[PDB]
């Protein structure tokens, strides 16, 4: 709600059929992870840990790369979106 007000300002070409943020193992995010640093350090609120699993709202991804690096267990299959997709920064 709060940061998706500011993500509305950015320009995107969303690739909804190709999620570039896949989580390799959902069970590592349930019992192996304690603090979930992918949620607390994502500048775009992409990751939200529900009890249904991890909700990865990849459409707002700013392609920074923090989630892949801050994740201690490596279970974020992180790619850039394809060419002409993802954030399209105007006056970046």
Partner 1 sequence: HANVVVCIKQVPDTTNVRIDRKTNNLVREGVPSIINPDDERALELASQLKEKFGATVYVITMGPPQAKEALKDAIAFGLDEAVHLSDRTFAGADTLATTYTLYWGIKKIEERIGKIDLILTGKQAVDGDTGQVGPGLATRFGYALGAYVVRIEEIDPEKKEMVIVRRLDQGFEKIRLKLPAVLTITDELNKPRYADLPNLIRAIRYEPIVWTHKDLGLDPKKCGFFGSPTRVVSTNIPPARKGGDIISKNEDPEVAAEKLIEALKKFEAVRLVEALKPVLEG
Partner 2 sequence: MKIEFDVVVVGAGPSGLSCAYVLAKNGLKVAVVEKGEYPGSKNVMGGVLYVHPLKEIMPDFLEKAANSKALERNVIEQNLWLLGNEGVIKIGHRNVEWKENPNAFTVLRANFDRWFAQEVEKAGALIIPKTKVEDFLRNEKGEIAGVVTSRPKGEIHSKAVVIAEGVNPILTMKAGLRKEDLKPHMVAVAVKEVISVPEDVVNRVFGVEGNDGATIELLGSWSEGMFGMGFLYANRSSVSLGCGVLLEDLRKKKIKPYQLLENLKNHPVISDMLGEYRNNTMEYLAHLIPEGGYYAMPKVYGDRVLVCGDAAMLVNSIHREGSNHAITSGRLAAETLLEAFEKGDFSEKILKNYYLRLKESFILKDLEKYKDLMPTMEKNHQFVEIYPDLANDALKRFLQVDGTPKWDVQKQIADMVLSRRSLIGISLDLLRFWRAVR
Encoding tokens for residue 36? 């979930």
Q: Does 11 bind partner 1 (CB under 8 A)?
A: yes
- Could you give the string, one character per residue 4-43, with x where binding to partner 2 holds by CB under 8 A and - elsewhere? --xx-xx--x---------------------x-x--xxxx
Q: Does 43 bind ligand SF4 (CB under 6 A)?
A: yes
DSSP 60: G
Choose among ligand SF4, partner 2, partner 1, none what residue 19 binds, the Cβ cut-off being 5 to 8 Å by kind: none
DSSP string across 23-46? -S-TTIIIII-SS-HHHHT-TT--
Tell me if 77 sits within 8 A of 23, measured CB to CB: yes
47, 51, 18, 1 alpha-carbon torsion, rounded to 10° = -50
- Specify the stretch interacting with partner 1 by CB under 8 A; choose among 7-15, 21-29, 32-40, 65-73: 7-15
Q: Does 73 bind partner 1 (CB under 8 A)?
A: no
């Amino acid at each position: 709600m709060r940061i998706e007000d500011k993500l509305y300002l950015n320009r995107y070409r969303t690739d909804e059929e190709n999620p570039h943020l896949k989580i390799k193992d959902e069970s590592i995010c349930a019992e192996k992870c304690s603090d979930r640093p992918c949620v607390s350090c994502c500048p775009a609120d992409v990751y939200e840990w529900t009890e249904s699993g991890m909700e990865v709202k990849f459409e707002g991804c700013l392609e920074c790369g923090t989630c892949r690096i801050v994740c201690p267990f490596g279970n974020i299959e992180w790619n850039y979106p394809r060419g002409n997709y993802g954030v399209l920064y105007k006056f970046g």
